[model samples]
Target chain A: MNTVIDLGSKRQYADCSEIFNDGYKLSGFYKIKPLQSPAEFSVYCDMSDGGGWTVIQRRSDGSENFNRGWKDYENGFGNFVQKHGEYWLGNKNLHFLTTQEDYTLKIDLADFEKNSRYAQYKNFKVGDEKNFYELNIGEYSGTAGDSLAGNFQRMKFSTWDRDHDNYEGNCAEEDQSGWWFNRCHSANLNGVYYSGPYTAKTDNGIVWYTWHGWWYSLKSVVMKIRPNDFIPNV
Target chain B: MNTVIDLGSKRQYADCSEIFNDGYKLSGFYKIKPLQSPAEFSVYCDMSDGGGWTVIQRRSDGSENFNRGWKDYENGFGNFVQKHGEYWLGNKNLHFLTTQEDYTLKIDLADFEKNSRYAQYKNFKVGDEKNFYELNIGEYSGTAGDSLAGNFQRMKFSTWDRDHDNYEGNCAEEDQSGWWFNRCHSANLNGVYYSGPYTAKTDNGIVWYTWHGWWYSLKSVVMKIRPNDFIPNV
Candidate 1:
């Protein structure tokens, strides 16, 4: 005898925020359709620390390189596994996601000493590609300090091939990473990973300058965003 | 000018647990259809302490009377407000809810001394009306001690007119409350509210014998239930 089994229809969500609002609290890869996107694409959802967060950038063991070109940075590249993987959720997607709502950006940082801290910015958004995905952030609040918004506020994203920093030299090329640079940065979460604190006083390595200074590379970094009015449902 | 507006379709939930699972975290009065019920009825949902709890009984003050007949206990009575007011979700509804899933019963008690404690019973359920809505509970755990399951396990519910207790006289009439009375009770959360510790060493007051003894009537009592496997989604 032949048997036919049917699986229920999959629910479509506009974003991780929408999925979270709809009562899905498990953190993992979920398909989302940004308003401007042609079709749905999988994105990592961080359902801890108040939930509803959509991970935009994550660096754990530095298995993936951050020193890429403008197109690569725009398109994004890396693994999307939880905790043990790295990925950048692309600039075009960020622009589409933030434009739809009033977003809050959160940066979770960890050091080799096992200490962890977070930096939060309200009214965070990214401009369209024509403006090189310029960073726009409001008031900062967190233990990690105002590293990004304090130094790189309104700066355009920079890569080795596309120099957008106000510095004399290409900040992306000099630092060997892609970032929103204003004469460099007080925070370069996408810079080279030195595993632990580096001896060199240079601006290289995964650095949140205000927290650990430029000489010490961070153990891990996670940058995520969610709608400001997101209320946790349980 | 004429304006037409669509309010959108209302979502129907089987119980408060289902509503909580569907992401409604706010605690309030919500309409629910118990499995054996003919129509939906309004019930208070207690969306705190891990969430998804369906309040079965609440006694904040002596504003509402608990000494009633079997029909009133079977059908339920009282207010459905949160923190304030009093109510009983009925034994019939309790049977319908518990039979649908493996439930855990939680009793929150606060004494006049400003101290709070809880009693939890896993696999909690009430039998049909034919059996006089018999009380069945298993595996006691929590700070309030195993007063109920230890003293009144497998006992039939008794009211002022309904003598189901094994004692010589009617325990419900003597204690002035409705409860699952074996000989009487080690815990009677539905008894008279004494405001504070009563001077009389009688079981006629809202008492959890193991926690505060018979003379000390509890200041507040809240009894609720949720599925044992209920995982908080936030």
Candidate 2:
């Protein structure tokens, strides 16, 4: 169905940016075709704030005269025009994708276990286009009324990551609380972003722009929410 | 740990005052045992305009007295004490447990499916006794944010009921949007109140409960939480 646009409801994740083998941050943009008086549409850029949202808007020929929502910053790949109302500019940490396809989101929460008060959420915007996007959000930050509500408020979905711990907490007090998650910016999942309980933390990072686009042509999006990370016996 | 005094902070099914069996209702008084008070202090029964609370004070005959913060309706159960507090009650249709043993609470919620939109939570509280003074609270209702702070609240420890529906709901819904629960005064998990998808026509007298205390036991009070309910997954 014309991608059910239930306000504030998201079914999957999409690609935002790209990473290079030599460590260069390949930036990109998700633009909506300017419709109904492009000049009248309000434009505002939504970035994480601390990063390079200050790139300049230049033409393909490097001409400075352009009308995009661009800013001035060194080493920026430039900016794109934002005339659409609800398209979010996903962080470029993922593979850029734009096509028809299905994606899914899923969860795995623990059953009120002691010393373990955390949960997690992930979205997969799978499409025939090799491009896709992925984001991970966590709950359990000690914030006063923030157990699960705070986690889902950001993306309408999130999970509990128990390991974030109490450096913050220790066995003596047995008060373990504080959320540790994979920052959308970090290139790798290390100490705080480890995928599971491990002896030396995990290097197995989360990458969303799976290069299957050339072959699959984005069909549909599929999301799967579950309790806990996996089925015990299975 | 001591029963969390802030009942509001526990996992709540959907929102408050909204009826549904998905969350635990405030049946009687909020009991407390602060060091400054004399015996167990439970004064949540400050409400009188509503239905009125049921406070069972001990009698000379060792029987129980039932008072509804007022003497308008006299009964051999309790007296309308004119002291520090009044009677606070929950749902008139809701069951307020008066046993001394501890019980477990559980809720069936929107599962780990990532792409689902009909998110909801159903809550259930076992109104039995384990003989232990401690209490157990759980939430099994709508998707988080649909009601409480956000993500479905409640710290539930799962107790498998042979009747759990894999896709149908285990808890009751606050609104008419839930799958298998009802709000009328009924026993937790009893066949009498399942307004779920699988038991679609149950509310119209298709189903009823002959007994409402089999699934509950304080075996842990003498046995603890989960004496026989902890049978290995066979």
Candidate 3:
């Protein structure tokens, strides 16, 4: 006698938000597939702050170097296991993730003085590689001021090798990091991490210009994205 | 011929932490059963701040009157629908919930001056009605200072009608709210809500002694509890 067996269908999640919607309320690394992304990859899902945040970038204790070339910034770098370790989730992944939906970009910055602030932008989007992963931000709301939108709005991403910024010289090379630089950025979160407050003329330290000015290096910075209309099911 | 069909079993949660552990990541009212409690009841599960906090008390504006009898304090009061509304989750429920495990009590205080601070106790528990629902707290941690443990250590719950405090008269009657009062209290969070700073000798305003003096009434206060060792499964 022949017997027939049935197996349940597997479920797939689009992003960290979908995973959170599927009843996974924890902040850690998770494998997710963005709607426009090529394949499934690991991303940190920050479920602590209102839930469902995909951390694209994190800088803490200066464990990882922010100064890298085009390919490194394009593909991403750093370790997520080292508890608040520095890392960038790649421009390609950010493009894929942001292109999928209307995402809100949240930037959390903490200084060595034990003070912290946040910057949130609604309708945050990133363009494909053809556009050099151009950044487009909407309404700003936060304590860290409108540094990103005011200085780098609609600007193309630039690395040491890729000269996409409006400045005469390479802003990424001068700032020692990759970012959307419009004649050099006012807020360079990916800049070189300095241990303490550095009173330098150059924007070499992880800077959130409005909060602590270019002289002070931020102790920690986290850039995470989430869906605009996300309302967690209580 | 008779046929039998089986349905899937429904899962039950012991507390907010259990619900959060089961993958529910939202801040709202949830039905929970404490291990030692008689039956299931509704509780506001605050999943925003690190997740899995059961809000026992919340004061925001003077909408709800806290000057009630022992029975009312034994049970709960106030509407949960109103955002940041005033409410007390009952001493009886607190006793049962805390008895289940070693809980951490987190108190968030915000002043009218836009200043906010928090106080967290490692091991927080409450005794039964037979013991007048006495308050027990462990090590203090947070910016709000050790207000609760310092003043009301081993103090019993006191209401206007039922006075269990060590004072000559009812501290509840004098303070105009229900709380764990020793001779009086250095921090009376349950006191009458004054709109602004009131320079009166009476301890009639919502106070956190260390942060602001007795004269300055606080704008908001939230008392929440969660499991001490509860780590979110990220």
lDDT per residue (tens digit) for residues A113-165 in model 3: 88899999999998888788898999999898877864544788877777744
* lDDT tens per residue, model 1, B1-234: 111111112556777778778776656566787777877776767888989888899998789988767778888998753346788888888888888888999999898788999999999989998888888998899999877863544788878777744433445354467788656477788888787767654558887888887788898888998889888877
- In the predicted model 1, the residue pairs found to clash are none
| Poorest lDDT segment (10 consecutive residues) of candidate 2 chain A | A1-10
Output the number of the lDDT-best candidate.
3
Candidate 2: residue A102 lDDT (0-100): 20
Every candidate's fraction of true contacts kept comes to 0.00, 0.00, 0.00
Tens-digit lDDT track for model 2 on A1-234? 110001111112111111111121212222221222122111121122111121111112211211111111111122233221112122221112212222122211111122221222333331211111223333323211122222221221111221222222123212111112224311111112222222322222211112111111111111122222222221
lDDT of 2: 0.21
Candidate 3 CAPRI level: incorrect
Between the candidate structures 1 and 2, which one is better when assessed by TM-score?
Answer: 1
Model 2 residue B149 lDDT?
15
> For residues B1-234, could you state the per-residue lDDT of candidate 2 as single tens digits?
111112112221111111112222333233432222223323333122221222322111112212111111111122223222222222111113322222222211221222222112223232211211122233433332222112213222111221132223345332112112223312222121122222233332111122122222110000001111212221
Q: Compute the interface RMSD for each candidate structure.
A: 19.9, 22.5, 20.8
lDDT of 3 at B170: 40
Worst 10 residues of 1 chain A by lDDT: A1-10
Q: What lDDT tens digits, residue by residue, belong to model 1 across residues A176-213? A: 67788655468889988897778654667988888888
Q: Kindly provide the TM-score of model 3 when superposed on the true structure, using C-alpha atoms.
A: 0.48
